[PDB]
Symmetry: D2
């Protein structure tokens, strides 16, 4: 049949893959090669980036996002830069959300302008700010959603109409949702990018990225962006592992989301916790938008602990099961305290303008028994807050 006709779990398992024609091997073979051979001069000319393993991953993700074609990359950052460096040149303009991944922010704020490409940062939770910042030279509107670190949302369908009316493309980073929870292209986005490093692979052992969009664009991203600009090839072994990890995407996302809701409710009920940011809680500022745009509220939670900086340090130093790390989207529950860890070299007043308060903790909820995670949190919080 055609894999675009089956239910979503069936697509997760099967799309882009088939038993090996010549051997019947069911697993996609790892084509760990750099060299492909021709049968003849003619065969070689006719042919005149490409690998069967990576192709299977690209086709699968294209199906899952409901896009025409996929392109794998060496990293999520390379998926973002290959895309934007393919689309933009000296004199072009980009309108970007402000609440985005920090390294994306550095690329947009420092790298692009040095190539003659200007960027305007706006609060993408306010579509009007996006409209106001558009220019005749604007090629791209770039957004992330949910956005960290307070899990605020962006109304993709609305922003898409705005960008399109002014002749720009919409690019959406769908990393934190995965195709299982959100499909930006179905809401009008033109291009979706992911760090597969997170939920798509899910097993914390692959760095990689993926871009999905129209065939016309993807061909340019491949034959110019990858080939002639970033060189950000995904290795066939990484692609194989990502295919393997993605087989369980549906069941992992269900369990991540189930666990995260329970933990979020526990945190909301806890007197030592001042705030809890999780789209699955009714008290969330854009709760209804989230209900329409996302099939599930996700596995990521942020929260503020009473007592600011020192409480945040005490709490992370007191967990026994949760692991301290800056990654998110793995099978293990991961936790971090940006102010004391990643952003301590930053000015307190400046961190605040990023939405990073001294007491903010970020939590990636894993596949453990939620009771064990809650017990670990409860224990650490109690220790941290007297």
């Amino acid at each position: 049949s055609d894999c675009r006709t089956y239910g979503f779990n069936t697509q997760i398992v099967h799309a882009g893959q088939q038993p090996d024609p010549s051997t019947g091997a069911l697993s996609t073979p790892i084509f760990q090669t750099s060299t492909f051979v021709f049968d003849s001069a003619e065969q070689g000319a006719a042919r005149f980036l490409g690998n069967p393993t990576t192709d299977a991953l690209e086709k699968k993700l294209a199906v899952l996002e409901r896009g025409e074609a996929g392109l794998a990359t060496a990293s999520g950052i390379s998926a973002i830069t290959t895309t934007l460096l393919t689309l933009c040149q000296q004199g072009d303009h980009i309108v970007s959300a402000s609440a985005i991944y920090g390294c994306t922010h550095a690329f947009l704020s420092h790298s692009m302008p040095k190539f003659g490409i200007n960027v305007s940062f706006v609060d993408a939770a306010k579509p009007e700010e996006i409209r106001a910042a558009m220019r005749p030279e604007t090629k791209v509107v770039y957004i992330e959603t949910p956005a960290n670190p307070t899990l605020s949302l962006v109304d993709i369908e609305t922003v898409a109409g705005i960008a399109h009316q002014q002749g720009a493309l919409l690019v959406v980073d769908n990393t934190f949702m995965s195709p299982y929870c959100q499909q930006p292209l179905q809401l009008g986005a033109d291009i979706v990018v992911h760090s597969v490093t997170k939920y798509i692979n899910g097993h914390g052992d692959v760095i990689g990225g993926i871009i999905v969009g129209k065939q016309e664009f993807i061909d340019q991203a491949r034959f110019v962006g990858l080939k002639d600009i970033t060189g950000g090839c995904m290795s066939p072994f990484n692609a194989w592992l990502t295919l393997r990890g993605v087989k369980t995407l549906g069941i992992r996302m269900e369990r991540h989301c189930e666990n995260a809701l329970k933990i979020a409710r526990f945190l909301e009920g806890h007197p030592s916790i001042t705030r809890v940011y999780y789209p699955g809680l009714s008290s969330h500022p854009q709760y209804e938008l989230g209900q329409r745009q996302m099939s599930l509220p996700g596995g990521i939670i942020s929260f503020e602990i009473a007592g600011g900086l020192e409480a945040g340090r005490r709490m992370i130093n007191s967990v026994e099961l949760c692991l301290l790390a800056v990654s998110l989207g793995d099978t293990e529950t991961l936790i971090q305290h940006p102010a004391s860890m990643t952003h301590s070299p930053v000015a307190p007043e400046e961190r605040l303008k990023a939405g990073i308060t001294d007491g903010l903790i970020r939590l990636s909820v894993g596949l453990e028994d939620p009771e064990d995670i809650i017990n670990d949190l409860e224990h650490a919080i109690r220790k941290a807050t007297f």
Copy 2:
């Protein structure tokens, strides 16, 4: 001791590597992870791209090229672009050899100018052309040597002095030589780049690149170029395989060079072969320069077969052992006929301005018995030339 003190074969085997401290495992473990964990908030802050497997490869190649530091990449193209996009910005200028890898040529001729970065192409076999093209805005001189497809040479030491006098850096693509045959940094180059896809890995199963240079530069290439521009990470599995492949670099290069000399002499003696391009033959235009600059003449050969385009096609369609492919630097002998294969979509008169004649064949000599390769060639040539 210090691995920088041992003979070159000893460095090939040992540099950058040591038994695993905690387990004693001799092979460098494959750290196939995306997540690293901290023991504490303090430990996490202190720390504030990086992987132990990839680090071992980078350190090894730094030792072999006699440079301070190494940086692995997703591909040879990404080693080149990460380097040049790190060094250059809008308004800057590059002077480049014309006889370079085609995809490098596309990046330099089309991508860079679209970012406000101008490139002048020159015949790098003539150092005076390099000097003449220098401008106040010139940041970089870029060269490849030997250069394809006629294996002409560039006098690295001379070009280095010229670039430096005018305040530019010299970047050298050392792919076709490997550190075993040529060390550009010892001749004055500031930065060396490789596609490890060729001889450094040597086994035709890895796409990857490496950059070697001063610590100050490599840090910028890593924390800005890779992190904030190309995203061209090498996967830890690729790094492991490359470490494994490089263990035999010395013995592979010796045998490649021994075999190539024998085949080159056979070809030079053959009445159906009009020209043979191989630095190891005295008849080579820059033979003496090659003798001073290269420890060995290399494994790559180009030659012209009598009867132009159709003879070239006939010959490649008649080999039985040599494999038709556009790659070079593997254990198997590889052969290609650019005019009928890769460059047939190109204009005959334009190909010529690239140095690609209708009868030009390129040969990557592998580890087979040279007698078998010669027999295969002799058979194919005879068939091709009546």
Copy 3:
């Protein structure tokens, strides 16, 4: 803490694993080495099979089965033979279930007797037959449950008491259940073995086995059985993949079992299906025993289609989503018709004595949407049965 204290899902994720001490890498490093180095002669003597990756897998499975120690092997068959060849010698006796894996049957019926080791086969669904077959020389009672191909059950606790009273050990093949659905050691078995090739790895890309039991036994299985008899080492890469696959064991088993129940009910309601064998259906002969012994009824189903041999062939030749294969326990739904496929070289009357009727179909239910599987089955059945 101690991983034996956490809930079962938490153990699945965490048991046997921890971030790498020296680097903090969260994924267990792949120690793909054959060589370990000593710091000194003394250090080498003190030390006087073993690999850190494989150790992590062995420790994890030991925790999940509630046994003292684990031992990984090159295959499920090697887990079984390493165990039994470690325990038994010339003149010893084994009492075995008759309804076991065919290749196990061949080892027991032909190999063992040629080594002076006698085996009596019995219907293990009848504990009295086990007792009756015991001899003074009986070292081992061996059983599988559920047993194929009709998914009949064996009362582990009862058989354990019988074997022990007569001084024998009980060995249980727990492949079809996994530790998530059944824990034989908690019911009195002394040793559990698995083909990890099925549910424990779950991704159809690893052949391997595991043995769990007391430390005293496992040491003998390791230093004599593996080292001095079968040589059935698991490679560290296989162990790594198995660790990776097992991370999702809980969520995979839940979904396999949920899907299988739905499909089993559909089949039971279908007029072209004469019988359906699935422990989750009340109509199953040992339903209550299954309820006490198994947390879930499993992902495997057998059923008989109307019209015997030719109907069975027609049906398997008519599925479009289910894949034809002799494996079971993967993410994809797999189907087979033993009589027309694997057992067609066998005598019809003999197949019957194995419980293989002409219309028997075996189904391994995967992670696809159950609706899609049911539609595929419904379509194939209808075609097969007019």
Copy 4:
């Protein structure tokens, strides 16, 4: 053509391998699968162990040893036991060399007799002892050569004639030579086995074994020995790495042998060294036999240091480049002192009956510059011997 027609280096590179038919991939794909799918019931029956990657390795090694067929295994020990447990049953007899690998000795001395299989150990350097020990029940003569730890030799051709005249098969462990240095089947042996863990893989990152012999035997070793007895499957990833490692077998063996000869001569000239055992030295007891039977004398050396046990300890504790390890046949130079390390739990007088004197050092010479190894040895010896 037919790969059995090319020179030996050409076979090393090419035999058993070809570009992937469907994709043209030159590297043998890693078929990391446990599941193979059928197109139909008929196709499934017709078919009624096997993996395309492993098949390529088996075919290659069969070509290199000039045997009909190959069978890969989980380890060298499993290659030996799968072979002998396939050939022998209760009441059968084996005549074995005494100077063999210790773990082989344990299998033969303890395991086999417990299965009703008797073994007689003899000094295989004396063919007459082999003849004298033959019985009507003798199925197999088993030998290793060179034999450790004094590198004594066995005259394969002579022993083969003796075994055959009395109706037995000759099995030869060719691990220390590799097919590049010795081909037992060409000298009359019926079956060759290797630990590929040593020179065939060569990179110290694979444990595995291989068996080569007639198709009739190999089929039994595969479908009964592996399938129904040891279960000692080689994983497809291990097979791929072994194929990769073997590509450089010719050039590695040449360099190992060149380096070992230089080191052996240095040691023979050294006044603190009492004896040096290396077939490449004229002073070797069976020098001429070695010249006829072996193309090269090998990479392994044993020697005795003045001052017995304590000198041996001092010397190994004083090397700075050589690595202490019990492995041999890697790219790094490895060294060990059996008496102080591996065999210190053994009785001094008993070690001697094994040929292990207190001063015996074993050295596996790697690919480093021989000058560096010699300097390291010279330094350690001097320190060790005042």
